[PDB]
Amino acid sequence: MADIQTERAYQKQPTIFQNKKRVLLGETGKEKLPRYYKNIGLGFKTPKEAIEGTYIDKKCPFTGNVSIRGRILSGVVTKMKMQRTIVIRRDYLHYIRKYNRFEKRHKNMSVHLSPCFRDVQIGDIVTVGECRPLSKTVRFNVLKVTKAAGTKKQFQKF
Amino acid sequence: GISRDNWHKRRKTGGKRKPYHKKRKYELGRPAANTKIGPRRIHTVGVRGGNKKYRALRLDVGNFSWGSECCTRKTRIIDVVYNASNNELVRTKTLVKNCIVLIDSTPYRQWYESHYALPLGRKKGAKLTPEEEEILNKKRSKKIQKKYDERKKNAKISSLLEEQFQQGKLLACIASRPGQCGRADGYVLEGKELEFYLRKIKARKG
Amino acid sequence: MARGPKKHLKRVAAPKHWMLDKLTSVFAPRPSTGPHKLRECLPLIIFLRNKLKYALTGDEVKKICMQRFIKIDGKVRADITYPAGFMDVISIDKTGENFRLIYDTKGRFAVHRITPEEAKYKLCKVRKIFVGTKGIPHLVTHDARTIRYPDPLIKMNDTIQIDLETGKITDFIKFDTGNLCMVTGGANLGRIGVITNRERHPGSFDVVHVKDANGNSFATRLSNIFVIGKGNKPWISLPRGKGIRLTIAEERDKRLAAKQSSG
RNA sequence: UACCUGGUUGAUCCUGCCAGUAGCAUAUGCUUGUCUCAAAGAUUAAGCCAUGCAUGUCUAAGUACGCACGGCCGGUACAGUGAAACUGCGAAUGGCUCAUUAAAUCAGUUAUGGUUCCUUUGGUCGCCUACUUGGAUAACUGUGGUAAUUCUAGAGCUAAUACAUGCCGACGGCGCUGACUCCCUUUGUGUGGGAUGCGUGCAUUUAUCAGAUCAAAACCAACCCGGUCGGCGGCUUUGGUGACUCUAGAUAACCUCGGGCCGAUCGCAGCCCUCCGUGGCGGCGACGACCCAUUCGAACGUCUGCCCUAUCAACUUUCGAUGGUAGUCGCCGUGCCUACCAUGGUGACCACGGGUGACGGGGAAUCAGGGUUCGAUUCCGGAGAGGGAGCCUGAGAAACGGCUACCACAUCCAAGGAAGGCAGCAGGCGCGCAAAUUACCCACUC
RNA sequence: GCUGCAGUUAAAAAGCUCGUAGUUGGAUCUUGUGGAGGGUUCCCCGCCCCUUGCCUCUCGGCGCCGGCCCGAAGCGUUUACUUUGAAAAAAUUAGAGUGUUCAAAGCAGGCCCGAGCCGCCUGGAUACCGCAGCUAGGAAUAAUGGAAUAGGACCGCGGUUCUAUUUUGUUGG
């Protein structure tokens, strides 16, 4: 937060300016930064954690430029071992009409994950949404994380 | 020729795809501008759908701004100091978006002196008294004080700013693509950026 | 083939609501560019020799249109093809005839003759609202007219009456439940009935239920609905058929009842 | 029509294959009156090609001093008819072939809030020259060169909606400076007017500001109104989407010239003058141009769907493989590319590799039910014009009825040079089991 | 040989066992009565506790006499399955109409008047479209879900911290 730079360049949000008006705070006060966020719409809600916290990322939709428009999908976490993204999976069933049986098939996809969510673990349900391309194999972003399935992450007393 | 295709390059699995359609005009390169600082040379380039695109080589003026008190004046672009994409570009004095460059700093003082009625850092007060005091002192009756009173205590001007006027240079940030626009433009550094890039400059060189 | 735009459309590629044959040659007319879309057009020459049968060859239409007996939307046109579509008025002043292009319950552009008094205006849907320069508004319609300074309560999916003579709409209808609507595309076509209910989905492809005076309920997409007048009271003249959408059994019964194929 | 029959034995009952049977499409033999419909060099050699033809285009309305025709006489925009030539537009459509191509092509479904768009349709149209500016080219006239080409030189003319220039009208436009001046509080501050300056249409690039209303009271400071000479009650201001750093607004600037816009263009037919051919203005068109919308699309992107093969099981990476950060480029989004940094990505749910007499789909043949086999081929999408690469013009092409080079071919030549690409319609050679007329015509359909 | 094959001897069960992937997996969590549609109980409102589970409300209509009542707004832990809508190029195919001389086809055509009507009437249906995606209803069947180291319910209170910009006419402390 007090360090968010490690680059060879300065990191900041667009649509923010630093005024040089008035002078009198005493000790400390306004961190000289109002926060930027926006609504996503479609019944999805911005996290409190985004508005509270400090990160500079342009590829998350709660802060940076990128819309969610078109499709909405789900998935599940399978792996995370990359920075500001994850890998996910989609289990589904393919039918054959000669037989009357189904069979299992899965694909894997990457998708970008905001620094807002940091409570992710491998095995959580995840929700995603169609976006403009961000990268070669990223076309999506997260909208929501949830856990509501068998063998939960922490003991029942919630 | 030099192209910006996408039907080359491996897929995720390390697979290759065999040659498909021959190169086309809407997937196309055309070599880099590589614009410097010098006397203005501009080339007009025909581009797709019409609507000509200006490529600027060797600019020497850009329209920077001081949005703290909202004045923007045309000023000369002296030299490069920091280029946050590469180290080599600074050495050959190449000018691209988000560089850090130097300016003359002249009209910003003229604007300040006339509007806030105070000079910046100065070598001596001896220079001021015969001429350049003629503007600063004023003969108005009635609006020697009446205008200037409202300008007072809105001109504290910060420490890192004031010291730079004395050198005759200021550190501003290119916020344009000169190779696409045909113009250099930008904003001048303030606040925490201006603290940051000083430290990078002193770190890297010297 | 393609490297740029195409300039041919064949017979069998062409839509079926122009009612083309298959024993005249490979090409079909193809409407040239204009305000209407080619899966919603009736090209001009198809009105003049595949409906009304004044002309017999395409060369005859070229000799007719030049004389300037033809108008479309109160202005004069003078080409073989023009893309007139739903809710436009053709006007031949020499014969003293006026037509209107509207849908049968079959879903094809019929002959709906009208008084010349009726043919002084048409009904136009609003599709987009766009603020122009210096605080001036605009309308956008399906017949691609940009009418400036509309009343400030008219919004999209409303309909507005336009005077062909002077533009500058005189009156309008407001989109509300229980008002009378016509369908302009989709599987249901040409049906007339009141709105009854609406349904909204955040996202796209909202639907709009409909009910008629024959006690049938059906639904269609939002963007295929067009308003014609207030509840059970069109502000336009209506053809025979009137959106009933009879089954095939009942249509058989009518024909053998009147015994009608001779006069 | 949901069907079986012959053959292993001395004889019998099984297992099992072979043969018989019917349809479909290619070749071939033999035969052949009349009537309608019509597929046809795909299989093999996307082998090679003589000759002919297959894309051009003028209205009342861009440019007519052709010594053309014509004239009723002319040119005083000046004829009527008009070859040629400049100018505008099209030639990126169609036609043809199936070689390449296994998540590619393609189909269904979705997305531009990531972009471009000739044209049509509808809007957009005033901050010593204007009674009209500047100077050359063709046709044409005349003289030539080369063995030869839709080759080309030199000389003498003359045009524009080609080319290059640039006013006027009506600016009585706006904000911030305030020479000053007036009243009451010296000032400050409360006031009213004010000469004098600079910027003040849209488009272009940058910075900054605004983009409003929620739920109540108690005193003090500056204050409106209901009204009075220290205090009570009563107000508050664009549009749109599910969602944008949207739309529109304000402030400070940037300006592209030779390289934004704001008409020096053309044709029909009328008028009015404190009045006599001028000063004025009205209708109907034609063309051109800037921006917005529309239409026809174009281009990328989403989800799902694929034939054979493991005697192909690990693959991919600084010769970018996967991701992060910044930049360049491009119509835009994007490792597309570059710098710096991280070490990922994929696979027994078959990756990776190899094969395909594999273009894909809409479909076709057979068929009780379930299937099997085929799809070069009239519709739609794609790819390619001998093999490769590069590029000009244009809104649109990496074009081949455009160009340049290399490579493989092949033609003419006076040996100096020059010219070419039938998988367009016919036609020839070759190849093979295997496939038509160097025909007639823009009347239909476009 | 999925529907629909065979493996003692006719061609044929790995020598035997362990074992991950894959495939498959026990039982168990609600029934009766008046009105309406169909019998003589049984299958749209309600009732025993439930009945399309709830509230909370507030903004824009309906009411009845300030006060009160009920539709629309969040949804019932999540899916498969099934049922209804939407959206699906033509030709082909199925198939309606029409006497092509009958037919293969085709999309036409049929009527009364000497011409003296200057005309009349009518068709160019309908079905189908693996998937996957979009929509609404059902809750049996098959997966998945909760408080056992407690938190569900009520304006139950305390302790602690942050923040919202409305009102005392307006603007500031």
Place this chain on the structure above:
RNA sequence: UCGCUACUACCGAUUGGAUGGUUUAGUGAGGCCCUCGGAUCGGCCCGCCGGGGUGCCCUGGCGGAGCGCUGA
């Protein structure tokens, strides 16, 4: 087993031949971009004449100088 004919496959010296496609290094046509280059052609200033005007001005014709400055 051995002997006799037609016929098919395999191994194989020859480090077989032919054709095609990959691959390291070297060489590299042609176009495009960039940086230079200036053959060559004009314009505006001073003499004489023509026109207009006040030795002189403007414009046209003609010649020469610096070819000065300037464009293509």
